[PDB]
Design a protein around this ligand. Structure first.
Ligand SMILES: CCCCCCCCCCCCCCCCCC(=O)OC[C@H](CO[C@@H]1O[C@H](CO[C@H]2O[C@H](CO)[C@H](O)[C@H](O)[C@H]2O)[C@H](O)[C@H](O)[C@H]1O)OC(=O)CCCCCCCCCCCCCCCCC
Ligand code: CLA
Ligand code: CLA
Ligand code: CLA
Ligand code: CLA
Ligand code: CLA
Ligand SMILES: C=Cc1c(C)c2cc3nc(c4c5[nH]c(cc6nc(cc1[nH]2)C(C)=C6CC)c(C)c5C(=O)[C@@H]4C(=O)OC)[C@@H](CCC(=O)OC/C=C(\C)CCC[C@H](C)CCC[C@H](C)CCCC(C)C)[C@@H]3C
Ligand SMILES: CCCCCCCCCCCCCCCC(=O)OC[C@H](COP(=O)(O)OC[C@@H](O)CO)OC(=O)CCCCCCCCCCCCCCC
Ligand SMILES: CCCCCCCCCCCCCCCC(=O)OC[C@H](COP(=O)(O)OC[C@@H](O)CO)OC(=O)CCCCCCCCCCCCCCC
Ligand SMILES: CC1=C(/C=C/C(C)=C/C=C/C(C)=C/C=C/C=C(C)/C=C/C=C(C)/C=C/C2=C(C)CCCC2(C)C)C(C)(C)CCC1
Ligand SMILES: CC1=C(/C=C/C(C)=C/C=C/C(C)=C/C=C/C=C(C)/C=C/C=C(C)/C=C/C2=C(C)CCCC2(C)C)C(C)(C)CCC1
Ligand SMILES: [Cl-]
Ligand SMILES: [Fe+3]
Lengths: 50, 37, 51, 34, 153, 344, 29, 30, 337, 40, 60, 28, 32, 178
């Protein structure tokens, strides 16, 4: 069977699930962008640009 | 959709379990001192 | 004092190493396996496994 | 403090005696070729 | 966007056995990686040219953050492309614009080529263009190159 | 009548005891050397753990300025340590029963002396134990020599150096940061980097890691296909099998083409002997270096060795490293010195 | 001047990269 | 009381070691 | 074909293999090594560090080096035809062009050697693990000799190719970065010491579990598909001694590949960190505690003091271009000393 | 001692998230193993 | 396999799998562009590094 | 390549050896 | 004779090294 | 105030620490005012400049140097036998511009004060109550970005080697034959 590292190889010969997995990664990255922006906005102080 | 043929089982022997536990806990020791600062 | 003490520590040290070496080889040669393990008489194979 | 010394002395003498007299009990015969 | 990509990911996981991924002659999973590269390169280059010609120049976009030599009067401003050698000055905003434009255009051209001409057999064999992991290797290379660059700048 | 007296002594009680002690059927082997090792290492370990967690500060330099080394006194894993015994004690034996109270004992650094002595004993016994099990199993007996190198290092920094310097307070602290401190001060007062034996040690460990990675990569490269794709190739080997699991000829050939043909080993026995020998010799030499520098035969001194025609000093890198050494020297133990020369 | 030095660097490099190249070709036939 | 965390991690490591020794899956000869 | 003939000639079985990779490797390797000898024998560092640096001046093997360029040169590539030396070889050596020469040619040399490992591996038909393992050392060279100075002010603070010079780089990184306190470096130390440990213990174990395949006491001569040593006996021995032993030869050899290589990579992460002065220098908790409480002392704070000493004194001599002037009254030091 | 509070979280989360991971894999691994050893 | 409208529309874009050009095909041209690219990267590197002075590489 | 390599290393080695000896006799 | 060549060469090498060691005590780098 | 703020070492990205978490305001605090430019002078009227701390140094000896780079003042470690202390040399500090504009200080205590502070570049006001600042310098987003991406680049160099290897050696990545 697959050792834990090599787990992700199950997508190598499966174009559809490769695309799916990439979609998941992309969703996570964009989601991180939005969340991070919200946190920064929640903690940011705009009262003195100098 | 149909049954996927690319599915494969995953293995993890007890030696790898113990090596993993050891790795995680030891890393924790080290960096713990640096995280608390 | 430095020359004498350091030199004789060096000597005493390596001489101890030699002691370990030759004592070990003396035991192994006396018992009869200083040249390797007998392929037809490997002790471990005649032992019950640890667990 | 003296009783502690007595204790530790007892332990040391014990294990040392076991070591010495133990290694005197024909140790070279303790090999797989015997 | 994250949510939509999430749902789409679920769908593509469920319906994996699309006919688009099969090879007509063998019924085996196959991706024509060279032509795919052609398409993706056309997309990327077109988007590059667009970003350089409209977003940065201000022709149809906000522009780029520009400030004085001592960072006191910074604001978003339209940036005219610098086509001369001064465009290769890392501190000249114009460069940015021109770069993308120029690069974009060249990319598009390359795209056309990669869309029409099949790979040399010897290069196809050497770079193992039937295996997707070679695309992974090359992409990783490009990516750490770019990473070193942005770290430097 | 030859060498070994092959004879027994008829199911006696003491003979039964000797049999159980020397039994090869025990999960962990407990030879006579183990009769010494187990109690020593246990005492050492208990005192070490308890002290590392809850021991009060210790007046290491005897100048009534206690240093905190335990976790419950404001330390973390990196800075925590078992502080070496007081310089007021020097090389005097300081067991618990020689102190008026446990509190005094803790104040003067008794734990350090206890732990160090017990540890050295138990580790020597560990070496002897390696020999012993080798003998009981009909093996060749030179693993304990290999292990004699690290034992020598430990003995160097925990016993010999305190002997040469006249105080256990100069022994290496049982802790990370304390170890770094030991190293820096040592560099300041012996210039160990410029000592050829330390260079030999660096050759031993760098070379050791090199040959480890090299041997590993070579054998891993020439593994024989016994496994399926994406499966762990380790499954392609079974414990106890007689067939070799890799192509030795292919490895030797690769190595031969990498450098040149006669640079490669053909005899695996020779190769593994070399693998054992290089780092062990390196470490041997470094251990000797630490002890002989423990008697102040320091590293090579090239301070102001280059002069110009007029007679002015032209500095080299040795002079710069001497500047750093000076920094450490003038800065270490700021309140310990009353006189211009540091002779202890 | 630096640009001229760059071009000249390309020149010397081209010479001493043609040297090994042609060397290999002559021993090739 | 980071000391609690340090003690926890150390105890964790030592436990892992203990089980690695006395609760290993036995090696079996071919 | 032309290219095919080139390939045939380059891949011929000679006493010293060449190959395409050889085209890159041999020139750069040769020039780097040669530049080191040339510099350590003839060239000085008087106009860059104010130091004698060659055998010609009176240096021995330990104190001789090819030192880093002058700080004023910045991160200049320092080409011989560059706007700094302007073709003049003498001024080029006086500036420190030999350092950049050695560094760049050494870098491309390393690339060429790794490519050599890959090429020979592919030609013979082996797995390319030697090259990977070698990615290790490369990471060390790139991070320490290139990335670290590129992050700093100039090539001046990069290691100088020499024994005592390297020693200087060491004590410098200790005094200024507290490099020993950095966890990544600690992992590196773990990797190296662990590597040496594995080398020694594997060598000794195999040598002392050997099968008697001869009559001579010289067991070397008695050496096939049969294992020359008893894996089972070894396993038994280390299981009863240490509590745990190897059972799989493949896993063993991979492991003693993995440990040191990983060490090197980690320490490299650390060094990049130091390139940006992003140090693991202090524990703020203990600094605050010590600031408020003059009776609180750990080995950490002691080492902090040590660092301060190092920095002052050497600061004046190690950075001559800075014109640092520290009156003897401002130099930190303890009583008497 | 004034320490960084987040550390707590970091450590624990760090430590516990792979630990669980490992355990999950291990046990299912063994389950499958057993099955295969049984039907042989 | 499942046939879809989008899949049918995109089908010809993934049908030339394995199709190659005989011999070296366009390799020399590619090599030319690669050499030019190396020249470019080296040029901008030297400009940034101030080894090639033309245009001051300061904050403008 | 044998000649080129062997001489490539050996020729400068001898050159340098001579040089360094000569240095052994350079007085202040 | 190969062994005579190796011996002579070795003596030569050791002689040059000895000259270097002597050079550490004389001329430049001798602290004199 | 902005320009004067740029000339402050607390905004130097090469003065931080790997495990000093948070924004820069967690270190020195939130910048309240520019105090103005401190000018130092001795009793002869020489304009003294405090030797600025280089990025390499976590700490730096306080040395006041004249226009010719000659030591005129400092703050002595060892007090006895010192000959450059501000109590002995007699130095004054006068602020120009900023909040402390046209204020002069002649007392040794205040001059020494503003001297330490001066080795850090221009001097500013700081709010260290809002974020409970710990009084140690932290890096900028520039520093963190550079760190993260440099190291990620290195690691990806490995990744490239590994996957390239698996690609070119696909046929033998499960072992070799005879
Ligand atoms: C991997 C596997 C293979 C390994 C072997 C590799 C073999 C190839 C070797 C490549 C060598 C690259 C050399 C890069 C030289 C450089 O960097 O040269 C540096 C120059 C900038 O030069 C420096 O610039 C500094 C900033 O100046 C600027 O700012 C100043 C402010 O006062 C002034 O305004 C000044 O006018 C203005 O120019 C200073 O002036 C310095 O004195 C000056 O040396 O940038 C530049 O050339 C270009 C910078 C952008 C691209 C950088 C990518 C590579 C470097 C990534 C690491 C960056 C740092 C991370 C550290 C971790
Ligand atoms: C460009 C991105 C990229 C992609 C798509 C892949 C893809 C792959 N790699 Mg790979 N790799 C990359 C970069 C990449 N790699 C880099 C940069 C390195 C150098 C460090 C490596 C080193 C590497 C090795 C050494 C191996 C792979 C393997 C694999 C395969 C299985 C991976 C798997 O299941 O992980 C399994 C991972 C887990 C179960 C969890 C472990 C997670 C670790 C501990 C930390 C992860 C970081 C964190 C979760 C998120 C941070 C993301 C970060 C990028 C910011 C797969 C084809 C394996 C292979 O060849 O299989 C056949 C293999 O052995 N890779
Ligand atoms: C007990 C041994 C011993 C001791 C303590 C001394 C001590 C001394 N000798 Mg003396 N000497 C000795 C043996 C000894 N010698 C022998 C055997 C000879 C015959 C060759 C000499 C010949 C001799 C002469 C001709 C002179 C001295 C001088 C001196 C003085 C200065 C020494 C000096 O510079 O050392 C230099 C130290 C070294 C070069 C270190 C040697 C390196 C060692 C051996 C390690 C290398 C071995 C290697 C690591 C082993 C590998 C290990 C392997 C097992 C794996 C000093 C009082 C000098 C003096 O002042 O006298 C008036 C002087 O002129 N000695
Ligand atoms: C590809 C590179 C690129 C990037 C990174 C940007 C980035 C940006 N552009 Mg830009 N632009 C580009 C190329 C690019 N542009 C090109 C090529 C052109 C050519 C004309 C322009 C023309 C342009 C104009 C004219 C303007 C911008 C603006 C902007 C800024 C805000 C836009 C934004 O964040 O969108 C982020 C978008 C996404 C992350 C996509 C999210 C998709 C979701 C579905 C959106 C739906 C939200 C909706 C409320 C919910 C729907 C519910 C659902 C069920 C349907 C941003 C800095 C604006 C700006 O700066 O204003 C100050 C602006 O006015 N750009
Ligand atoms: C790599 C990209 C990147 C970069 C450059 C930054 C940069 C920054 N972040 Mg950010 N962040 C990122 C990704 C990134 N972030 C991601 C992916 C997340 C989501 C989790 C966040 C979430 C986040 C928050 C919530 C906050 C920041 C904040 C900050 C700022 C200060 C951070 C600081 O002090 O570092 C601290 C860095 C370290 C302590 C380094 C960690 C040690 C290294 C990585 C070694 C670890 C290895 C080890 C094996 C793993 C642990 C062992 C484990 C087993 C116990 C800084 C501008 C702060 C901010 O903006 O202030 C308002 C803040 O509050 N970040
Ligand atoms: C440093 C060591 C190193 C090593 C061992 C490898 C190894 C490999 N790479 Mg690779 N690569 C590297 C660095 C390295 N790379 C770098 C730094 C980049 C740039 C991001 C790349 C980009 C890259 C790509 C894009 C591809 C590979 C591929 C490969 C594989 C096939 C061999 C190959 O094409 O080599 C290439 C090695 C070289 C060309 C050597 C470089 C020689 C240059 C041209 C010298 C010129 C310098 C110039 C004259 C002087 C500069 C002056 C300057 C200072 C101003 C192999 C695993 C291929 C692969 O895996 O496909 C399966 C592939 O597609 N690599
Ligand atoms: C300082 C320590 C150190 C040295 C001296 C060293 C030396 C060597 N290692 C090699 C290999 C390896 N080392 C490996 C693992 C390791 N290597 C390590 C560290 C070292 N490795 C460590 C710690 C590990 C464990 C991870 C592996 C897996 C290999 C190999 O496969 C390879 C080998 O073949 O071994 C038999 C050889 C590569 C030959 C070559 O590249 O020629 C080409 C020469 C070139 C390109 C010139 C480089 C010039 C350098 C970069 C700068 C100039 C230096 C000058 C001299 C400086 C003098 C100093 C005093 C500063 C070479 C003998
Ligand atoms: C995140 C999860 C990480 C899990 C790690 C599992 C680790 C693990 O499972 O190892 C065991 C594993 C063996 O794999 P095999 O090919 O034998 O596969 C068998 C299967 O059961 C694996 O699923 O080795 C590796 O995965 C590669 C790394 C080698 C091990 C070295 C890395 C560990 C170093 C530990 C150092 C700590 C002590 C230092 C003291 C100074
Ligand atoms: C009285 C006797 C006292 C003996 C001393 C005590 C020794 C304790 C040794 C514990 C080993 C634990 C191994 C776990 C992992 C484990 O169970 O691995 C088991 C493993 C067995 O390997 P196999 O050959 O069976 O593996 C085949 C496949 O599973 C590979 O995937 O052993 C090794 O890999 C050899 C390396 C062990 C050497 C590890 C040294 C680590 C030292 C500890 C570092 C942290 C200390 C922190 C202290 C705060
Ligand atoms: C579904 C849907 C939706 C929703 C969406 C959402 C809600 C999203 C979100 C998203 C998100 C929200 C994302 C996030 C992400 C994040 C991330 C990606 C992060 C990462 C990080 C990491 C991974 C790290 C970690 C760590 C640290 C640093 C510390 C501790 C340790 C650890 C490792 C844990 C809507 C309605 C709209 C529409 C459509 C449908
Ligand atoms: C820089 C440069 C260059 C280059 C040059 C060269 C390449 C040179 C080379 C050089 C060389 C190539 C040199 C060599 C040298 C060598 C030597 C110097 C040696 C020494 C030796 C010794 C010292 C010995 C030792 C030993 C051994 C081996 C072991 C045993 C012991 C004894 C001690 C005997 C050119 C012109 C291109 C260009 C410009 C720049
Ligand atoms: Cl004193
Ligand atoms: Fe082996």
């Amino acid at each position: 069977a697959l050792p834990w590292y090599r787990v992700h190889t199950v997508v190598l010969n499966d174009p559809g699930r490769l695309i799916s997995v990439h979609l998941m990664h992309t969703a996570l990255v964009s989601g991180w962008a939005g969340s991070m922006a919200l946190y920064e906005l929640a903690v940011f102080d705009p009262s003195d640009p100098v | 959709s149909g049954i996927n043929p690319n599915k494969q089982p995953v293995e993890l022997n007890r030696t790898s379990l113990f090596w993993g536990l050891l790795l995680i806990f030891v890393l924790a020791v080290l960096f713990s001192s640096y995280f608390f600062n | 004092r430095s020359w004498l003490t350091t030199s004789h520590f060096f000597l005493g040290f390596f001489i101890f190493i030699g002691h370990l070496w030759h004592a070990g080889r003396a035991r192994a040669a006396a018992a009869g396996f200083e040249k390797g393990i007998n392929r037809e008489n490997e002790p471990v194979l005649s032992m019950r496994p640890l667990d | 403090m003296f009783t502690l010394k007595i204790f530790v002395y007892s332990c040391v003498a014990f294990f040392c005696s076991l070591f010495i007299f133990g290694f005197l009990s024909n140790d070279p015969s303790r090999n797989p070729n015997r | 966007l994250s949510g939509l990509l999430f749902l789409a990911s679920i769908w593509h996981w469920v319906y994996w056995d699309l006919d688009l991924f099969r090879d007509p002659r063998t019924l085996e999973p196959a991706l024509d990686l060279p032509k795919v590269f052609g398409i993706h390169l056309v997309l990327s280059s077109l988007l590059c040219f667009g970003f350089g010609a409209f977003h940065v120049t201000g022709l149809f976009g906000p522009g780029i953050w520009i400030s004085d030599a001592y960072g006191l009067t910074g604001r978003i401003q339209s940036v005219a492309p610098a086509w001369g050698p001064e465009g290769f000055n890392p501190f000249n905003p114009g460069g940015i614009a021109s770069h993308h434009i120029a690069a974009g255009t060249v990319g598009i051209l390359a795209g056309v080529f990669h869309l029409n001409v099949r790979p040399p057999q010897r290069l196809y064999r050497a770079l193992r263009m039937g295996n997707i992991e070679t695309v992974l290797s090359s992409s990783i290379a490009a990516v750490f190159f770019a990473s070193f660059v942005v770290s430097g700048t | 009548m030859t060498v070994t007296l092959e004879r027994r002594e008829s199911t006696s009680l003491w003979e039964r005891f000797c049999s159980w002690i020397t039994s090869t059927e025990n999960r962990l082997y407990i030879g006579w050397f183990g009769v010494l090792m187990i109690p020593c290492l246990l005492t050492a370990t208990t005192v070490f753990i308890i002290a590392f967690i809850a021991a009060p500060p210790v007046d290491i330099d005897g100048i009534r300025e206690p240093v905190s080394g335990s976790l419950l006194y404001g330390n973390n894993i990196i800075t925590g340590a078992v502080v070496p015994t007081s310089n007021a004690i020097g090389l005097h034996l300081y067991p618990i029963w020689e102190a008026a109270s446990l509190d005094e004992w803790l104040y003067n650094g008794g734990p350090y002396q206890l732990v160090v002595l017990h540890f050295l004993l138990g580790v020597a016994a560990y070496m002897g134990r390696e020999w012993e099990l080798s003998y009981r199993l009909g093996m060749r007996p030179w693993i304990c020599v290999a292990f004699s190198a690290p034992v020598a290092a430990a003995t160097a920094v925990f016993l010999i150096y305190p002997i040469g310097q006249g105080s256990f307070s100069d022994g290496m602290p049982l802790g990370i940061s304390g170890t770094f401190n030991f190293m820096l001060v040592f560099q300041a007062e012996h210039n160990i980097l410029m000592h050829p034996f330390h260079m030999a040690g660096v050759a031993g460990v760098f070379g050791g890691a090199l040959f480890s990675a090299m041997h590993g990569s070579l054998v891993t490269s020439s593994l024989i296909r016994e496994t399926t794709e994406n499966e762990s190739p380790n499954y392609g080997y079974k414990l106890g099998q007689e067939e070799e699991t890799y192509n030795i000829v292919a490895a030797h050939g690769y190595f031969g083409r990498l450098i040149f043909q006669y640079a490669s080993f053909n005899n695996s026995r020779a190769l593994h002997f070399f693998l054992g020998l290089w780092p062990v010799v390196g470490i041997w030499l470094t251990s000797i270096g630490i002890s002989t520098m423990a008697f102040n035969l320091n590293g090579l001194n090239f301070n102001q060795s280059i002069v110009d025609s007029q007679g002015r000093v032209i500095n080299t890198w040795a002079d710069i490293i001497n500047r750093a050494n000076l920094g450490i020297e003038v800065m270490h133990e700021r309140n310990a010195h009353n006189f211009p020369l540091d002779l202890a | 001047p630096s640009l001229a030095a760059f071009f000249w660097s390309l020149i010397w490099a081209a010479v001493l990269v043609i040297l090994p190249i042609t060397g290999a070709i002559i021993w090739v036939s | 009381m980071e000391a609690l965390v340090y003690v926890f991690l150390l105890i964790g490591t030592l436990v892992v070691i203990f089980f690695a020794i006395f609760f290993r899956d036995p090696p079996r000869i071919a | 074909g032309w290219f095919d003939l080139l390939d045939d000639w380059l891949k011929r079985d000679r006493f010293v293999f060449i190959g395409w990779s050889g085209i890159l490797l041999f020139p750069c390797a040769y020039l780097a090594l040669g530049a080191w000898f040339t510099g350590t024998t003839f060239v000085s560092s008087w106009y860059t560090h104010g130091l004698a640096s060659s055998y010609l001046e009176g240096c021995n093997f330990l104190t001789a080096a090819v030192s880093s360029p002058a700080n004023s040169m910045g991160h200049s590539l320092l080409f011989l035809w560059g706007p700094e030396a302007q073709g003049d070889f003498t001024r080029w050596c006086q500036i420190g062009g030999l350092w950049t020469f050695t560094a760049l040619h050494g870098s491309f040399g390393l690339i060429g050697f790794c490519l050599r490992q890959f090429e020979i591996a592919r030609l013979v038909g082996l797995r390319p693990y030697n090259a990977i393992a070698f990615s290790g050392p490369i990471a060390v060279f790139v991070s320490v000799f290139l990335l670290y100075p590129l992050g700093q002010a100039s090539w001046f603070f990069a290691p100088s190719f020499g024994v005592a010079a390297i020693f200087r780089f060491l004590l410098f990184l200790q005094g200024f970065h507290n490099w020993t306190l950095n966890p990544f470096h600690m992992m590196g130390v773990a990797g190296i010491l662990g590597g040496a440990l594995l080398c020694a213990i594997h060598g000794a174990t195999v040598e002392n579990t050997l099968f008697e395949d001869g009559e001579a006491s010289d067991t070397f001569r008695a050496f096939q598909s049969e294992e020359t040593y008893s894996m089972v006996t070894a396993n038994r021995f280390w299981s009863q001694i240490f509590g745990v032993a190897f059972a799989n030869k493949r896993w063993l050899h991979f492991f003693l590949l993995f440990v040191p290589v990983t060490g090197l990579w980690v320490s490299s992460i650390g060094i990049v960190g130091l390139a940006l002065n992003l140090r693991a220098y202090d524990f703020v908790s203990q600094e605050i505690r010590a600031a408020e409480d003059p009776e609180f002392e750990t080995f950490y704070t002691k080492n902090i003091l040590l660092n301060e000493g190092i920095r002052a004194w050497m600061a004046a001599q190690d950075q001559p271009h800075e014109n640092f002037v520290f009156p003897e009254e401002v130099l930190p030091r303890g009583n008497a000393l | 001692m004034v320490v960084q509070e987040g550390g707590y979280l970091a450590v624990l989360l760090g430590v516990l998230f792979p630990v669980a991971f490992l355990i999950i894999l291990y046990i299912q691994s063994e389950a499958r193993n057993a099955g295969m050893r049984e039907a042989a | 396999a499942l046939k879809t409208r989008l899949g049918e529309l995109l089908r010809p874009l993934n049908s030339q799998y394995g199709k190659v050009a005989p011999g070296w095909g366009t390799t020399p041209i590619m090599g030319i562009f690669m050499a030019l690219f190396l020249l470019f990267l080296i040029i901008i590197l030297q400009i940034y590094n101030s080894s090639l002075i033309l245009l001051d590489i300061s904050w403008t | 390549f044998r000649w080129l390599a062997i001489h490539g290393l050996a020729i400068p080695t001898v050159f340098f050896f001579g040089a360094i000896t000569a240095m052994q006799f350079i007085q202040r | 004779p190969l062994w005579l060549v190796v011996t002579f060469g070795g003596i030569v090498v050791l002689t040059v090294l000895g000259i270097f060691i002597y050079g550490s005590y004389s001329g430049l780098g001798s602290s004199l | 105030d902005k320009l004067a703020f740029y000339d402050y070492i607390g905004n130097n990205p090469a003065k931080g620490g790997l495990f000093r978490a948070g924004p820069m305001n967690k270190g020195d605090g939130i910048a309240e005012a520019w105090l103005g430019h401190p000018v130092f002078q001795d009793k002869e009227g020489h304009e003294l400049i405090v030797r600025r701390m280089p990025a390499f140094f976590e700490n730096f000896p306080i040395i006041l140097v004249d226009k010719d780079g000659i030591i005129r003042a400092d703050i002595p470690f060892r007090r006895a036998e010192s000959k450059y202390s501000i109590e002995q040399v007699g130095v004054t500090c006068s602020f120009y511009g900023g909040k402390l504009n046209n204020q002069s200080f002649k007392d040794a205590s205040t001059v020494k004060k503003y001297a330490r502070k001066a080795q850090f570049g221009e001097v500013f006001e700081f709010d260290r109550t809002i974020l409970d600042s710990d009084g140690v310098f932290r890096s900028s987003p520039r520093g963190w970005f550079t760190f993260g991406h440099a190291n990620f680049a290195l690691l990806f160099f490995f990744g490239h080697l590994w996957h390239g290897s698996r690609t070119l050696f696909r046929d033998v990545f499960a072992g070799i034959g005879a």
